[PDB]
Symmetry: D3
Subunit: 216 residues, 6 copies
Amino acid sequence: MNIILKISGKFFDEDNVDNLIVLRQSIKELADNGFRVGIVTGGGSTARRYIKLAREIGIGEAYLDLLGIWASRLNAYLVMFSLQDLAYMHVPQSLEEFIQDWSHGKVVVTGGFQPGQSTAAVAALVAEASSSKTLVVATNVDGVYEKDPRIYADVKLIPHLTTQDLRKILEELLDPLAIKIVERSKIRVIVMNYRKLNRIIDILKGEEVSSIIEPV
Amino acid sequence: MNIILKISGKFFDEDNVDNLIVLRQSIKELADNGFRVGIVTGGGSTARRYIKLAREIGIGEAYLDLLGIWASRLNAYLVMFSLQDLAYMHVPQSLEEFIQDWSHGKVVVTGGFQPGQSTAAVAALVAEASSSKTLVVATNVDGVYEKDPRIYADVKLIPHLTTQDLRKILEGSQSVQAGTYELLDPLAIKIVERSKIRVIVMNYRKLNRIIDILKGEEVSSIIEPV
Amino acid sequence: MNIILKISGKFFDEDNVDNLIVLRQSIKELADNGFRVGIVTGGGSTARRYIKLAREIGIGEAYLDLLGIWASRLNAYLVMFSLQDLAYMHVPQSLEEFIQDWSHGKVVVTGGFQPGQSTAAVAALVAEASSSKTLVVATNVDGVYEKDPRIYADVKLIPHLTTQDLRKILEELLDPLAIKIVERSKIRVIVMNYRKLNRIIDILKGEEVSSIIEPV
Amino acid sequence: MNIILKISGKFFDEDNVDNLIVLRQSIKELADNGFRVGIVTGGGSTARRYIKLAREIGIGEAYLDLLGIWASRLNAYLVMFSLQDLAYMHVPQSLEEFIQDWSHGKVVVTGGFQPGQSTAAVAALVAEASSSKTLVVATNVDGVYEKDPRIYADVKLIPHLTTQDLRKILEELLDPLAIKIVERSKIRVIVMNYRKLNRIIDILKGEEVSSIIEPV
Amino acid sequence: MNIILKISGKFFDEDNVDNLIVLRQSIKELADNGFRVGIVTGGGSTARRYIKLAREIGIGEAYLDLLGIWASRLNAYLVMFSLQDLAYMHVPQSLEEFIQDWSHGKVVVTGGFQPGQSTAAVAALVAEASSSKTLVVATNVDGVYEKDPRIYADVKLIPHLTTQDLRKILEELLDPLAIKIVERSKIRVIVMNYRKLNRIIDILKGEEVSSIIEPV
Amino acid sequence: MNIILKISGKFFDEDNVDNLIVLRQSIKELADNGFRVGIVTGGGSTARRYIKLAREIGIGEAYLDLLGIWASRLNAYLVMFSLQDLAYMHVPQSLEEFIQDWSHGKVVVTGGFQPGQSTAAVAALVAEASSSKTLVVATNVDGVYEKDPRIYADVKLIPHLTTQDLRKILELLDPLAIKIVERSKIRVIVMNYRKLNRIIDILKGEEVSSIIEPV
Ligand SMILES: Nc1ncnc2c1ncn2[C@@H]1O[C@H](COP(=O)(O)OP(=O)(O)CP(=O)(O)OP(=O)(O)OC[C@H]2O[C@@H](n3ccc(=O)[nH]c3=O)[C@H](O)[C@@H]2O)[C@@H](O)[C@H]1O
Ligand SMILES: Nc1ncnc2c1ncn2[C@@H]1O[C@H](COP(=O)(O)OP(=O)(O)CP(=O)(O)O)[C@@H](O)[C@H]1O
Ligand SMILES: Nc1ncnc2c1ncn2[C@@H]1O[C@H](COP(=O)(O)OP(=O)(O)CP(=O)(O)O)[C@@H](O)[C@H]1O
Ligand SMILES: Nc1ncnc2c1ncn2[C@@H]1O[C@H](COP(=O)(O)OP(=O)(O)CP(=O)(O)O)[C@@H](O)[C@H]1O
Ligand SMILES: Nc1ncnc2c1ncn2[C@@H]1O[C@H](COP(=O)(O)OP(=O)(O)CP(=O)(O)O)[C@@H](O)[C@H]1O
Ligand SMILES: Nc1ncnc2c1ncn2[C@@H]1O[C@H](COP(=O)(O)OP(=O)(O)CP(=O)(O)O)[C@@H](O)[C@H]1O
Ligand SMILES: O=c1ccn([C@@H]2O[C@H](COP(=O)(O)O)[C@@H](O)[C@H]2O)c(=O)[nH]1
Ligand SMILES: O=c1ccn([C@@H]2O[C@H](COP(=O)(O)O)[C@@H](O)[C@H]2O)c(=O)[nH]1
Ligand SMILES: O=c1ccn([C@@H]2O[C@H](COP(=O)(O)O)[C@@H](O)[C@H]2O)c(=O)[nH]1
Ligand SMILES: O=c1ccn([C@@H]2O[C@H](COP(=O)(O)O)[C@@H](O)[C@H]2O)c(=O)[nH]1
Ligand SMILES: O=c1ccn([C@@H]2O[C@H](COP(=O)(O)O)[C@@H](O)[C@H]2O)c(=O)[nH]1
Ligand SMILES: [Co+2]
Ligand SMILES: [Co+2]
Ligand SMILES: [Co+2]
Ligand SMILES: [Co+2]
Ligand SMILES: [Co+2]
Ligand SMILES: [Co+2]
Ligand SMILES: [Mg+2]
Ligand SMILES: [Mg+2]
């Protein structure tokens, strides 16, 4: 079974050894349970700092996105280096390169690809290219809520929903490209807290707090 | 300053020497008028044919898009080879590669980059990266109409509109499938809006009048970013 | 052991799903019988079409050949994508790249390399580099005929011959570089109909209609 | 002439629009005065943060250096993007790539190359490969002091010294590779405060506060 | 006007900087006279030393050619490094890469490309791709002779001949691919002594001992 | 376990078949004993020859090193081609590329990377990146001596020493090589390449060699 894990950039902002460790464990563990794993890393606050500074000097939007992409790639190298023998030792820069890299039978870690999208879209593209039926989005909230839970207090986690529900809820988590891709290739998305990465197998069994998004 | 020309795949389906001859001429005329030019080529019926066959054997959507991309790149090599000394002799395979290639001060010709988008999105990205204020979409209709002019008769060509208008004209008509025919896709519109790029939709049959079109003195549609 | 299969461009001109299905099937068959397979695809009518148009506008012969090479590569991607996990996911652009790609232990699919030759020469080069003792040319024709079966009716098939017989017959199929390479490295060439890709194992035993060309 | 500017990673830690801006004008100015410019960017606090976290999870020293190198490249992209038409739009990853990139006649911006050295060593190697006779180290101090001015109060700036003096002062500013290279190729090094980049032409004339290091 | 210059590997066997100095001189002579120059270097005795040793341990013919190609590339780097600012600083490894490298408007130096041919064939391909109407073969003999002048003593130089004559004379210098290419693209070939490289302009004007081969 | 074997350029200057056949058999000996092997080849006399000529025409030091690097790469291709199926068929040009190449589970053969260092420094970098605990330097001398045995008569072989001893002796291994083996605690064995036939015995400490302990 092939699975893709998107790791929120916020995971890297914590500057917390435990995050990396728990991720390392989780990949080792998925492997032992017969999964091939691809990982996509977000840009986080590093991306936002570089983007903000570049924007203030008039750097255009393409190049701003590219700085965000390089920040995401820095996080990809960190993860890749933490996996040593498990991972193919190259961070692909495009979907085309990911396909080549995935051919080596090992874990592949990637950052961004192209301006105008997020790393959630990259995770979807990479899930599609690897025939992964499940994309896990490991982020800093427990699942999908009615509204953004870091604005709105007492908002309820939605354990099971569709991509058409999600679109309405979102009007970052998943961008338009990500949703288009998971819909056309019928990829199931699980949104979970990265804190619960130590419990990843239980989440895939549906035993633990998460949101499951069905493609329609 | 800089301009991007998207050339519809349908231009290549015609298999006509005059098409290439006239594109070639227009580029020279743009250069001689002080423009740097980037060119994006569509995949056309070659793309569709490969996509259809691959889809019949169960090949997934990512790989279908890639076949479409490789068909577009074949057209890009044709165009690039027709330009000889004017062009940097490399077809970039990503936006990042385009930026590097654009650095050589010559014409750059590209095809597709990534699954889930069209060559119009590529042309928008490449316009954004080259600080082109104008993207020209040279296609097999004279401009933008209220509805598809190859489906609906005596709809009127819309000479000047906004991206908001275009979004409504094109809304609800587009499939997520590899090989879908589009004018401008969602990524293309997002990009031209965020970077304030004006889009001119014209017939490639009038590439011989490319300067007059830029001056607003020939049949075309001008789309203003909002 | 290692075998190279050249697939005529005419195979791709048929725009027939059943062809790909049998190629796919014939390669899994070879793998299951202990063969490592490399595949070279021809440019076919797409190549001739681009070449003709480019030639009309005065494009030089190097660039015409390159357009034919890119058309061949488009067919290589199609075949590579049809093989999914069996193939290393990269189409090598040179013999040097083929050697690197072959190092991954998987099926490698290539198109052309260099102006002034055909994809048959590429297949020979790739046979030589992979220590393949046999090169199979799967074409639109049953074998080597006394002359061109496209043009002449009732001409007969030569089940067996040498590389100088072939040169004399030819002065398509195999070009000068292809013959020089198979002669210097003593590679046997089997010419067969791509329809018969199903009996590829029977053809290799010598138990189906084909022409075997011995290197001298 | 050709000149190389090393920009301390501390320049990027300031998260200050002013810094990038003043650097932008300095290259434009150097260009207008007939200089070809190469730029090498340090990794700064981003590099330190990634290295510290990776070290805590047992990542080996090669990979720690590589994280520092990727952080320095992120800063190189920022600078390169700020220069737009003036710069060749590729960040070289080795000295060999730098030499190819430098061939385009434009500004080249680089980060790190190889574990076991600093970006000062990169700036030296790049100065040597570009036949630059002057390397400017633009850092967060006015020049070379008797001892580290960020530690030792009341220490005096040394306006003119040799590479053997510097070696004794240091026993990072310049590492062993950097010193070896500037000695063997007789490259003069100017240490200056990056805050005075606005005044860069006056520094090259010797008419502003700086330290000039002569190769011996 | 574009011209290609093939420099015999024997030029590099001589182990003398006077040869490089004259070649270097020759290229400035050509540039200053309005020529764009491409250079192809032979492998010489280094290639022969590696091929012989590899052949003794049973290394196959593809790989023997590749060792010869790498030897030719070492000579290409030497020449390219001797040209400094005049040359684009990349040695292309294929015809496709040459075309990209030629796009920079500078001198391009190459070695070999592909097994089964010589550097003369490379020079022809590169002449064809650069629209060069003249290929100069600078070798250790004054021109073309009625037979190999190092094997049969006292034979006459042929100052003016055709490619059909040459193919009869040769039944080294130019291989079958080289001849096919210069014929199809109508490229004139001048065979000269590399000792007379100082007098390339006079040779191009037909005022110095050489053989001119006309394509038929 | 992972091991790196640095082969002196002098090995390639000798021009005899046995050398290659006997390197070839060692790695197959090492592989069969459970080792993953990386190999770094020196530039030898080919390097010095190109360097000397280029230096005479005024070519700068960066480009002289690069010519030496290309000569080392030519030796790497020779070795790689002699190993056939055992090796990943790419010579990496940087430490970054080596790491990617090493990911294929096969033998990787490298030459130089970067001006200002030697192929011994490459071997140390590559040992560090592959988590090799042992770097073998197979050279034209039996081990480490109190001083250069070519330049000095009657000197003795030191069977066991530290990296701090070695840098006093050298005032084989360059400064980057020593820094890297010290920071990553890599043991270096210096041996004669003529004894590549008894490489397993050398690793067990059962033949003539010098072992250098990192301090
Ligand atoms: N209102 C209105 N007014 C005027 N015309 C309209 C209107 N509404 C519809 N139309 C119609 O648009 C048509 C013009 O569209 P056209 O010029 O052909 O542009 P197209 O792009 O569709 C053809 P084309 O120019 O051939 O190229 P594409 O198809 O982009 O690319 C091929 C294929 O490759 C894939 N791909 C490509 C690039 C990339 O980065 N990623 C990718 O995945 C993807 O699967 C692609 O499908 C025209 O005939 C009208 O009838
Ligand atoms: N309906 C909803 N339910 C849950 N979370 C929502 C939401 N709407 C918005 N969010 C927000 O989505 C955020 C997660 O996005 P995520 O951080 O994983 O993407 P990312 O990797 O792009 C972040 P970065 O920009 O830092 O890389 C949450 O922190 C939450 O505030
Ligand atoms: N004596 C002979 N015996 C058999 N076939 C012959 C022949 N002489 C010429 N041919 C022709 O050679 C063709 C086979 O060549 P093939 O099509 O395999 O090469 P290719 O892949 O280069 C074609 P494309 O240019 O379409 O890619 C047959 O269709 C046949 O007409
Ligand atoms: N004798 C001396 N004179 C001046 N500065 C000295 C010094 N000895 C040490 N330094 C220190 O050198 C520092 C500058 O090094 P620099 O910041 O240029 O290297 P770098 O780019 O490697 C830093 P980073 O690790 O942030 O990238 C100063 O901040 C100063 O504290
Ligand atoms: N008919 C003929 N006229 C002149 N020279 C001939 C010849 N037939 C053979 N030769 C030989 O060809 C040699 C020139 O070949 P050249 O050295 O240019 O090719 P090359 O670069 O392949 C040599 P290397 O293999 O050393 O690189 C001469 O030394 C000469 O002895
Ligand atoms: N104390 C010492 N003990 C042993 N050898 C010493 C030495 N000091 C210097 N050397 C010299 O170093 C040589 C070994 O260097 P080695 O050949 O391993 O490096 P290398 O591969 O860079 C050579 P090349 O430059 O030819 O490729 C010995 O033959 C010896 O001459
Ligand atoms: O393929 C990608 C991935 C990321 N980004 C940019 O990099 C930032 C960091 O990624 P993320 O963590 O926000 O998804 C994004 O906000 C966006 O600007 C892209 O442009 N394209
Ligand atoms: O290595 C190659 C392979 C193909 N071709 C060109 O591509 C066309 C397609 O190959 P084939 O299928 O015709 O052999 C050929 O006619 C030829 O022009 C080359 O120049 N070199
Ligand atoms: O070529 C280089 C450049 C940088 N670094 C690493 O990246 C850090 C950031 O560069 P600097 O700003 O410290 O020079 C260094 O301390 C060092 O760990 C290297 O290993 N090699
Ligand atoms: O494209 C090339 C160039 C060179 N060689 C090989 O390298 C040797 C050196 O080239 P030359 O100087 O003999 O032409 C040749 O004998 C030949 O084996 C090739 O195989 N292909
Ligand atoms: O990483 C390397 C490897 C080699 N060399 C150069 O190549 C020569 C040949 O390598 P070696 O065999 O001396 O180690 C060296 O003297 C040196 O000039 C380098 O500059 N860097
Ligand atoms: Co985000
Ligand atoms: Co370039
Ligand atoms: Co053909
Ligand atoms: Co530092
Ligand atoms: Co690989
Ligand atoms: Co040495
Ligand atoms: Mg379309
Ligand atoms: Mg020869």
